[PDB]
Structures are given as C-alpha cells and as structure tokens.
Design a protein around this nucleic acid. Structure first.
Ligand SMILES: [Zn+2]
Lengths: 205, 208, 105, 156, 121
RNA sequence: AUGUUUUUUUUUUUUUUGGUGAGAGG
RNA sequence: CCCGCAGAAGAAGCACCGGCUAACUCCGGCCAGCAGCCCGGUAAUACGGAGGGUGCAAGCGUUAAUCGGAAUUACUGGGCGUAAAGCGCACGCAGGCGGUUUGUUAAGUCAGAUGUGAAAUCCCCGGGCUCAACCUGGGAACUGCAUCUGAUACUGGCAAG
C-alpha cells in the first residue's frame, strides 16, 4: 500500500526532480539525476506514444504517492465532475490531506507529511483526521495538535517550506502551526511540467 | 576479386614508387627484406603519430628514409631528440648509415591512408561505422577532393552475417589511368572480428 | 519617439513602482559554487533568472512556458539582459535624509 | 516554432536480377500548433535520409484548418482510399481521443480536444491523408455566414 | 440490408463455439491419466513434447499438455487440467502443483505458473 | 510428355537545432 | 471511540522485460523447453539461472466466462463488375412503396395535461459514519403505456378533381 524503496531512483527514471527528498541537499549531489536507474542507464532511446503517457502518469502518481487503483478512482471522479478532467484530477490530488500538510510545511517531504497524518498529529477543524487520502475542503483549517507541536521535525519542515515558494491557495501560520485551505487550487497555481492531458488520454484508451 | 589495385596500375604514369633504389639480383631480395623490416618498425612506433607514407631511398651504402606524417611535432618530439633516436634503430635494422627526413602532410583529410586509419580507430572505439564513413566522406569533400569513396566490410555492428557498405561522393574514376587516385586500406581488429576499410580519394587528373 | 526628459523627486510609491522585490539579506552569493543567494542582494524572484529562459535551479529547458515560477525555484523566466533594467528596493528601518538635499551648498 | 512528428517508417523492397534492393519510406507530419498542417512521405535507401526527405515534403504543401479554440468546429468525416475517418469536437480537458497516425496529425495541427475514430483501413499513410481531408473540408461559422449571405448571429 | 428485408428476417448473430469444450464452462477439471507419452510437433518445430491422454471427471477423453521441465505423472494419476491449446489436437494444460501433478524442480522464475513453492534461505 | 519435387527466418530506427597605483610615446 | 505503555519494533510479494507491450544484459545446443498471435541447430535481450529493470501490490498471476475492440450481421453503421455476394429470364397474388390539386377527417405524427411507470439500483445536489467503500434526504430519470384537450405541414383514410 506504499512505495517503501529508493526514492531518488524513481526521480531518475522520470527524468525530473519529483521532490521525494526534503531539499536541504540538492538532488544532483545525492544521485545521477540525468542517468536512468540500473545497469542500462546511459542508453536512452526515444520512447513510444503509449510509453510517454505511461511515464507521465507514473510521474504524477510518484509525486503524490498514490497507488494505481486509487489513482484510477480519482481519475474516474474527475471525469464524473464538471469542468476540465485533468485539472479536476490535479485538484483532487492536491486536496489530499498529506499533500496539503506538505504544502503548508509541516512535513519536509510528502512522505513525512503522510507519516505525520497517520500518527494522529494533524487535525482538520479541531478533529483528529488519520487518513492521508482525506480530501480537505475550502475554509477547512488544518493544524498540528498540541502533543505533536513540540517535535523538532515539524519546525525543520516549516523552515524548509519557508525557503520553498509559498502556495497562493493556502494561508499558514508558523507560530500557531495551523493553515487554512482557502480554496481548491487553479491549474495556473500548480506546476506547468505535468501534462495532465497525457494522463487523461492514457485512461481514455 | 574483381578490381585492379589503383596505386599499382598507375606506378608508371601518375603515381610514384615508395622504395626508390637500384640493385642487382644479388642484393635486391635483401634490400627488400630490410625495407619491410624498417617500415614495419616505423608503423609500430609511429602509430599514435598520423603517418601516411614511408619512402625509402638508399644511395651509396646509406639508407634515406622519408616519413610523410600529418603531425611532425609528435614524430620529431623535441627538436632532433625523437628523430635521432629513430635513426639509429633504423640503421641497426638496415646495417648501414641511416638518414630520416620528415615530410609534413598538408590536409590529412585528403590523404586516403590517414583517413582509413582514422576510420579504423573510430571503429575500434565503438562508434557507428556509418557515421564515421559519412564524416570521412564529408570532410574530404569540404577540403577540396574532386571525389572520394570509402568502403567498410564485415561484422558491421557486431552482426552475425557480415556485409559491406560504401559511400561515394563526387567522381572517382578508376579506369582512367591519368586520374590521381590516392587509394589505401586499413583493418579494425574489433571484438567481433576484423573490419576492413578501403578508401579512394580522387585529387584530380594529371595532364602531360 | 520622445520629447523632453523630466526629472523630479522619487516618492516612496514611485520607488515601490520601480521595484520588483524587496532586497532583504545582504548575502551576495554562495561563493563556493556558482549559485547566488535566495533571497539576498542578487536574488532570483526579485529580479530574474541568470540564464536566458531557464529556471536557474531546474524546470523549462526549451521554449514553451516562459513565465512559470515553481516553489522550488522562486525564480522569474525571461532574457539575460532583463536584470539590467530591473531594480530592487531596501526597506530602510529608520528614515534617512538624502545627502544631496542636505549638503549641496 | 513548427513541430514535426514521424508517424511511421516502413521498409519496402524492389526485386532485381541479383536479389532484393531494400529501401525505406518515412511518413511525417508537421504543424505550427495552429491551423497549419502538412504531411510528407519521403523515400530513400537509408532511414534518416528518407525521414529528412519526408520532413522537407511536409514543410512545403501545408494546409490551413479553421479551429474554434482548442477543438474542431463540428463533427467531420474524411475519407481517402480505404481509410474513412470520423472526428468530433470535444470539451476542454478531454484530450485527443484518436488512434495512431490520426493522433499525430491532430497533435501537430494544434487540436487539443477531439473524439475521433478511424473506420475502415488504418494504413497510416491513407489515414493521415483522410484526416487532413477532413480538417480541410471543415468550415468555420464565419465562413458559412459569408457563403450564405448572413451574419454570425443569424447562424448561431 | 433493406429495412423491410431486415424486418422480414433479422440479422443473425455469429455463434462462436468454445475451443475448450471438455471443461464445460469450468475453470479447471479433474481427470485421470489414461496414458502419458511424448509426441512430435508439426512443422517447422522439433521436439518430444510431453502430453497425457486424460479421462475427465465429466466423461470426456481429452489430451493435455504437460508444461515445465520433467514430470512425475504415470497412468492412473489424478491431475487438474486448465484449458489452453498448444499450437494437433491438444487443447488443455495440466496444472502443475495441483492434485497428483508435482511442481517443477529447481525453478525460480515464474514459479506460480509451475506450482513451485518459494525458495527459503 | 512432365513439373508448387528439398523448404528453415540468412529477421523492419534517424540524428534533432572589472577598480587602484606606477612608467613611456605624441 | 478516547487515553497511556514500550520499541523500528510484528508486517512484501506476484507477474513480466523479442514485437504487439512499460522494462536488457551475462552465464548455461531444433535438445531441454517457451508460446495469446507472429523463438531454440554453440556468440538466444524469446528456453533455464543470475544480476539489473518494468508493472501491479496484500495481493499478483493463470484458467473459465460475458461485452468491448469487431463498422467482423453494419437500426445508428457494411457490402455484391474482378475480393464472399444479382435468382438464367419473365409474369404475377400477398406484402412494401406511390404523380398532382382541393375539401374533409384526425389513424400515424406533433404539443400540453392527467393517471400510472413499486421500492431499491443508475445519475445530480446534499447529509452521516475520522475518509472511503457503505449508509442516507430530496430531485432527476424510468426513453413506455393508457386517457383527455388541442395542432393539421407531412403520411394514412374518405370524397371530388
Ligand atoms: Zn523553475
């Protein structure tokens, strides 16, 4: 139910930096980010039409840490919902509790955030929510509870975030350690490199 | 084995000889042997130096070698240090007083042998043979060859079934005797086997 | 193209309108590598990307999305001469009178 | 600015006294991400050369296509030889739902959103041609208005 | 084709027969080996392919391929067949590692497909 | 007068487009 | 359901990597074996093992079965000179279709209403289980059938041309 292996390998495979490590130390120093994993890394022949789409899908999934069935479900939901499908999917992905936490800066990585969520550190509207897939709504305040507020990791995460660009769709307080999910993010607010359309196509086989 | 050797057919007309001496039936074989030896030695030595043509010429119990090379600097080394060294060994090989001259080859892309050697080297260091061939052809053309042909043969890309491929550009008349056709050959001793490289470079026609 | 050149005083609203970002930290560059400082004198978000149409840190290495600013880079995405026209502003904690209007004789 | 996609490359033979002479056909298609599209079909003894030729061909004899935003203006059929093709305009987000050669042509054309089925033959060369034809025939609202002697609001 | 014609006599659906009829819409069937033997395949191939004529539970007498390297089967050995045809007249495979048919010896990849338990170390 | 009379894989991918200070000449 | 306790602790496999099809190398002789369709005879990315990778993941493969792809029974939506496909040719009952004008009818057709079309299910907006599945409020839908009141271009009936 989770990917427990090497994180940088995934990144290498993808091509890009997936942000699977905190960002204290640059990704180029930790691993050969350009070279693909395994014995046959240096060889890089152009991929197929299907293959590129698949890769794209993987990238997105990897980024958020969502396994396949769940991803499929999300896609379906997006399709069902009104408006642009890929965009909707992206929004849904964002909405995940762990992701939100990460954005806020209470977790160094998304993985860390997820862990925190699991371990009953986070509350959503003053009620302890344990599910990483929990879809956080507009105007839903989300905070660290008083037990987990003393942790050194949390502050480190916050610091890291502060170095990292702040998302417009949230509003977080470092002292209070509570952030308000103000609105579901627009496509423009998210990263431009993610070809959602490819993903959509893949499932529209 | 269809074709006549392009150098060999033209030795009387437009191409000259490499070994250039007279000898009676007594000493001729020996001389030939000596030439073979010295040439062999030179090839062994000046592999890294781009060497095209060794011209041996022995008058009056004294051997005059003339090395045509693209880069004299690596053959000469420090001024009269490497050449001198070469000389004594040459003498030893011969059993006579030696004299080494070094001709500087202008335009090594137009010298056929050199090109062939380069191609072989490329093959050895695992490039795409075809791309190498193209480079060879293109470069020569750029330099002002009236034409060039190159041919490579056998175990191309380590394939089980051997084949030959060849690229021509411009005009390369072989039947025309008065055509200056610089022909030469080389062999790439790859992991899969030998790959023979031929190259014809047509400088132009001589009028006399 | 243009007539006369007009010179006047600079209002704080006018200086905030010239500007593209507050220069906080005094840290010039990294000095052990090649990267600058985020966010110091020679910033990324306040001014622009060192390389032309490139996020200095890592995204956009072709000519499609000129402008996107990810959180991992905090960088604009324009020309190499774009930083020559862009200027920063330092929020002086304590007011300081100009020396040209205090000692001009 | 122009994007160019090699759809297919196929090895074709000619029998001679000696044996078989092989050659390569390259089908490419190029477009500017707006109305302009053009396919090219190039042939040579080696692949890359053939591809280049195809590209060259494509770059000349382009064709304009009226695009209402990211999608088509109305459902359009296009036929050529075996390949008969249907393509239908679709809502923003849906992506190019189309198969093979057809997809490639659409992508370069700068349609982002289509629902497209290739009936009949799916021989890349024919199908791309069919697609092109379909695109070409497809008229815009303005054009239709012009034709009919009306305003755009009269047609809706 | 003509609508009237269609009305008169509607369109016949192509009834596709099952290529594994001795199963009778069962995922596997139990059977007893009537005889076990090797057979030579058709052109262009060359081998001695191990196969057993099986009398099934439901009454059919079929012939079932035996996959993997080596097998313990004899006459009167109770085996499970699964359907799948080897590319004359063999339309079924013995399930290795079910009933009397053993898993393949010394096999470490695709183990499931030959009944083999996970190697311990 | 006559020819399905010795078949076996001897296999499909490019290239891509800078301040500081000193000295001389006129 | 909540609180406390200890300590990374008790918790990852399955299939695949010739092309289709995401993933490649080395070592073991048309055998042993593989195979869904289209390898193996001594350099096998196709057999078996290894290392490396890819895809799924408390599951993963295989088999069986249904729809899909299959516009490959084509109502939507195919064809028939040569690819399968025009009766050897006619007459002709039933059947199908029917030039043009007016009038009338109102069967078909269309419009509106009424009754019904069980609940659940599906779909939309909500709510409740920490989320989800699940449960659940209200709607929409259930393409229909029947009846009543209109419309009369088209098709039909009847009457005259
Ligand atoms: Zn960037």
């Amino acid at each position: 139910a989770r990917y427990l292996g090497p994180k940088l390998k995934l990144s290498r495979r993808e091509g890009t930096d997936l942000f699977l490590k905190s960002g204290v130390r640059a990704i180029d120093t930790k691993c050969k980010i350009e070279q693909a994993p395994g014995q046959h890394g240096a060889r890089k022949p152009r991929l197929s039409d299907y293959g590129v789409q698949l890769r794209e899908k993987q990238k997105v999934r990897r980024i958020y840490g969502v396994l396949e069935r769940q991803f499929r479900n999300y896609y379906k939901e997006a399709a069902r919902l009104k408006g642009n499908t890929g965009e909707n999917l992206l929004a849904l992905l964002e909405g995940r509790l762990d992701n939100v936490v990460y954005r806020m800066g209470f977790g160094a990585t998304r993985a860390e955030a997820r862990q925190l969520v699991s371990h009953k550190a986070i509350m959503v509207n003053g009620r302890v929510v344990n599910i990483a897939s929990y879809q956080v709504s507009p105007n839903d305040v989300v905070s660290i509870r008083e037990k987990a507020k003393k942790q050194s990791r949390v502050k480190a995460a916050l610091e890291l975030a502060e170095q990292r660009e702040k998302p417009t769709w949230l509003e977080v307080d470092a002292g209070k350690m509570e952030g308000t999910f103000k609105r579901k993010p627009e496509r423009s607010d998210l990263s431009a490199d993610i070809n959602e359309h490819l993903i959509v196509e893949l499932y529209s086989k | 084995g269809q074709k006549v050797h392009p150098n060999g057919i033209r030795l009387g007309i437009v191409k000259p000889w490499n070994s250039t001496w007279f000898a009676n039936t007594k000493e001729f074989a020996d001389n030939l042997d000596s030439d073979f030896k010295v040439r062999q030695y030179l090839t062994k030595e000046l592999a890294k130096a781009s060497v095209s043509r060794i011209v041996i010429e022995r008058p009056a119990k004294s051997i005059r070698v003339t090395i045509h090379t693209a880069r004299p600097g690596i053959v000469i080394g420090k001024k009269g240090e490497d050449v001198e060294k070469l000389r004594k060994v040459v003498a030893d090989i011969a059993g006579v007083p030696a004299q080494i001259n070094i001709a500087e080859v202008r335009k090594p892309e137009l010298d056929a042998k050199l090109v062939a050697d380069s191609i072989t080297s490329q093959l050895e260091r695992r490039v795409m043979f075809r791309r190498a061939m193209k480079r060879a052809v293109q470069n020569a053309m750029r330099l002002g060859a009236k034409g060039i042909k190159v041919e490579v043969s056998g175990r191309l890309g380590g394939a089980e079934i051997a084949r030959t491929e060849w690229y021509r550009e411009g005009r390369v008349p072989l039947h025309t005797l008065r055509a200056d056709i610089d022909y030469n050959t080389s062999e790439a001793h790859t992991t899969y086997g030998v790959i023979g490289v031929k190259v014809w470079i047509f400088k132009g026609e001589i009028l006399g | 193209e243009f007539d006369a050149i007009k010179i006047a005083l600079a209002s704080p609203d006018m200086i905030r309108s010239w500007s593209f970002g507050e220069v906080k930290k005094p840290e010039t560059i990294n000095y052990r590598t090649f990267k600058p400082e985020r966010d110091g004198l020679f910033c990324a978000r306040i001014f622009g990307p060192v390389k032309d149409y490139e996020c200095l840190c890592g995204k956009y290495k072709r000519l499609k999305h000129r402008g996107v600013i990810c959180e991992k880079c905090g960088v604009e995405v324009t020309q190499t001469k774009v930083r020559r026209e862009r200027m920063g502003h330092i929020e002086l904690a304590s007011p300081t009178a100009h020396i040209w209007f205090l000692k001009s004789l | 600015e122009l994007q160019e996609k090699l759809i297919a490359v196929n090895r074709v033979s000619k029998t001679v006294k000696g044996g078989r002479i092989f050659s390569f056909t390259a089908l490419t298609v190029v477009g500017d991400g707006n109305g302009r599209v053009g396919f090219g079909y190039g042939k040579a003894r080696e692949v890359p050369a053939a591809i280049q030729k195809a590209m060259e061909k494509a770059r000349r004899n382009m064709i304009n296509v009226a695009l209402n935003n990211g999608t088509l203006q109305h459902p359009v059929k296009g036929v050529h030889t075996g390949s008969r093709v249907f393509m239908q305009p679709a809502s923003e987000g849906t992506g190019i739902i189309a198969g093979g050669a057809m997809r490639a042509v659409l992508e370069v054309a700068g349609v982002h959103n289509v629902l497209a089925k290739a009936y009949g033959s799916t021989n890349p060369i024919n199908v791309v041609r069919a697609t092109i034809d379909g695109l070409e025939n497809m008229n815009s609202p303005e054009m239709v208005a012009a034709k009919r002697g009306k305003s755009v609001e009269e047609i809706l | 084709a003509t609508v009237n014609q269609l009305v008169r006599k509607p369109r016949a659906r192509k009834v596709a027969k099952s290529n594994v009829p001795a199963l009778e819409a069962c995922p596997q069937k139990r059977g007893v080996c009537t005889r076990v033997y090797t057979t030579t395949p058709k052109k262009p191939n060359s081998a001695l392919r191990k196969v057993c004529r099986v009398r099934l539970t439901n009454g059919f007498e079929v012939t079932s391929y035996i996959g993997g390297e080596g097998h313990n089967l004899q006459e009167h050995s109770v085996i499970l067949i699964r359907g799948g045809r080897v590319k004359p007249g063999v339309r079924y495979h013995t399930v290795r590692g079910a009933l009397d048919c053993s898993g393949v010896k010394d096999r470490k990849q695709a183990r499931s497909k030959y009944g083999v338990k996970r190697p311990k170390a």
